[PDB]
């Protein structure tokens, strides 16, 4: 597998290379706002499919397993992207450069202010850690590979697929540690920060689950 022979620097380069376009959105009501968010999301999903195929390891999986991973991860991936690009804008969500919203406007959609507050809190956590882009890109690839791995499904092939995914996840871990070491963190600081980053993924899961619930309800 291409993926397992990559050095840490080459993994970082591959993930940076793969980054999708940040899209521009094409008074407010609940209806119009969900309309704008839905349109933007649907456009970002097109680019996400191609992004995912450029994540080291992903293409080595069956098309069935690729689809399953994306079906599990897609809202987490949209949200972490949103949080990243909102980082430098306290109190706001940068849905697109021409669609920058504050929490007051979240209340447009009954049920959405909960989600907006959670996103802002994540953005504030990123800011508080001084999260860097190389770390963000690693976390995004972790979500892709990890979120649907526990709900695969009966064949030796499938077990071999999961082993592969875990091997790649280990390489992304090595890559995070490398970035941190290169940044002059102590061994102690490196493990503490690795933990801080990975714990945020539990919150991104939680938000995606609340998002999915809202989408289904409507």
């Amino acid at each position: 597998s291409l993926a397992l022979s990559l050095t840490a620097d080459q993994m970082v380069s591959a993930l940076l290379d793969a980054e999708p376009p940040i899209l521009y959105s094409e008074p407010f009501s609940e209806a119009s706002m969900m309309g704008l968010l839905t349109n933007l999301a649907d456009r970002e999903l097109v680019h996400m499919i191609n992004w995912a195929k450029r994540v080291p390891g992903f293409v080595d999986l069956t098309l069935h397993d690729q689809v399953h991973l994306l079906e599990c991860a897609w809202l987490e991936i949209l949200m972490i992207g949103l949080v990243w690009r909102s980082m430098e804008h306290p109190g706001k969500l940068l849905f697109a450069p021409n669609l920058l919203l504050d929490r007051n406007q979240g209340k447009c959609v009954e049920g959405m202010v909960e989600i907006f507050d959670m996103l802002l809190a994540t953005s504030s956590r990123f800011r508080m850690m001084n999260l860097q882009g190389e770390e963000f890109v690693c976390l995004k690839s972790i979500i892709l590979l990890n979120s649907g791995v526990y709900t695969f499904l009966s064949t030796l092939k499938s077990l071999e697929e999961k082993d592969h995914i875990h091997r790649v996840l280990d390489k992304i871990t090595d890559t995070l540690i490398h970035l941190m070491a290169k940044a002059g963190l102590t061994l102690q600081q490196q493990h503490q920060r690795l933990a801080q980053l990975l714990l945020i993924l539990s919150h991104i899961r939680h938000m995606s689950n609340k998002g999915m619930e809202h989408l289904y309800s409507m």
Partner: peptide, 11 residues
Amino acid sequence: LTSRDFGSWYA
């Protein structure tokens, strides 16, 4: 325009 145009990067 990508994520690269936002935030801080190690490199």
